[PDB]
Amino acid sequence: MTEYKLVVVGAGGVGKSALTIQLIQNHFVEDSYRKQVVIDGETCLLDILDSAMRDQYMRTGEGFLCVFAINNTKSFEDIHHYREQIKRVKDSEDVPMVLVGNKCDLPSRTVDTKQAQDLARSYGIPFIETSAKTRQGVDDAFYTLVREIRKHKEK
Ligand SMILES: Nc1nc2c(ncn2[C@@H]2O[C@H](COP(=O)(O)OP(=O)(O)O)[C@@H](O)[C@H]2O)c(=O)[nH]1
Ligand SMILES: [Mg+2]
């Protein structure tokens, strides 16, 4: 079956681990994960990972979940750095990515959905708000990234 190498990036504390645990273990709170799921009918295995070893993992990774938290303006501002690093290490301008705004269950929002939608539009990538606590958007975020990887492999 097809294997998809995913890498989750973003500032500390945004919920990268919480998100992946919710996806894989189905509960709210390991540096890597491996599970078989069915996405759009295709059975596939998700291999997920949250200096030279970092670069190797980025070269191996086929899609990147770029995570900020809606209550962490710095983490949103840092997205550009993470995106630029991935493009540099992979030496490519077309890298499958999804922008994730996590912790959308919390009331302390400092990043407006519109800001994140505009950023994702500039990058040409999908944007999805998630909550690792309530599971809102979690499957959609990872499955959307897999769909982005497919389009890149087909087109
Ligand atoms: N309310 C809420 N807390 C979250 C969410 N995601 C993560 N957290 C909490 O944020 C803290 C940091 O999460 P963690 O997954 O360790 O962040 P990481 O450093 O990005 O891997 C923990 O206390 C989590 O329980 C979320 O969607 N909602
Ligand atoms: Mg973590």
UniProtKB/Swiss-Prot annotation:
Keywords, comma-separated and alphabetical: Acetylation, Cardiomyopathy, Cell membrane, Cytoplasm, Deafness, Disease variant, Ectodermal dysplasia, Glycoprotein, GTP-binding, Hydrolase, Intellectual disability, Isopeptide bond, Lipoprotein, Membrane, Methylation, Nucleotide-binding, Palmitate, Prenylation, Proto-oncogene, Ubl conjugation
EC code(s) of this entry: 3.6.5.2
Subcellular location: Cell membrane; Endomembrane system; Cytoplasm, Cytosol
NCBIfam families per UniProt: small_GTP
Disease: Leukemia, acute myelogenous: A subtype of acute leukemia, a cancer of the white blood cells. AML is a malignant disease of bone marrow characterized by maturational arrest of hematopoietic precursors at an early stage of development. Clonal expansion of myeloid blasts occurs in bone marrow, blood, and other tissue. Myelogenous leukemias develop from changes in cells that normally produce neutrophils, basophils, eosinophils and monocytes. Leukemia, juvenile myelomonocytic: An aggressive pediatric myelodysplastic syndrome/myeloproliferative disorder characterized by malignant transformation in the hematopoietic stem cell compartment with proliferation of differentiated progeny. Patients have splenomegaly, enlarged lymph nodes, rashes, and hemorrhages.
Subunit structure: Interacts with PHLPP. Interacts (active GTP-bound form preferentially) with RGS14. Interacts (when farnesylated) with PDE6D; this promotes dissociation from the cell membrane. Interacts with SOS1. Interacts (when farnesylated) with GPR31. Interacts with RAP1GDS1. Interacts (active GTP-bound form) with both SHOC2 and PP1c (all isoforms) to form a tertiary complex; SHOC2 and PP1c preferably bind M-Ras/MRAS, but they also bind K-Ras/KRAS, N-Ras/NRAS and H-Ras/HRAS. Interacts (GTP-bound form) with MAPKAP1/SIN1; inhibiting K-Ras/KRAS activity.
Protein role: Ras proteins bind GDP/GTP and possess intrinsic GTPase activity. Plays an important role in the regulation of cell proliferation. Plays a role in promoting oncogenic events by inducing transcriptional silencing of tumor suppressor genes (TSGs) in colorectal cancer (CRC) cells in a ZNF304-dependent manner.
Protein name: GTPase KRas
Originating species: Homo sapiens
Gene responsible for this protein: KRAS
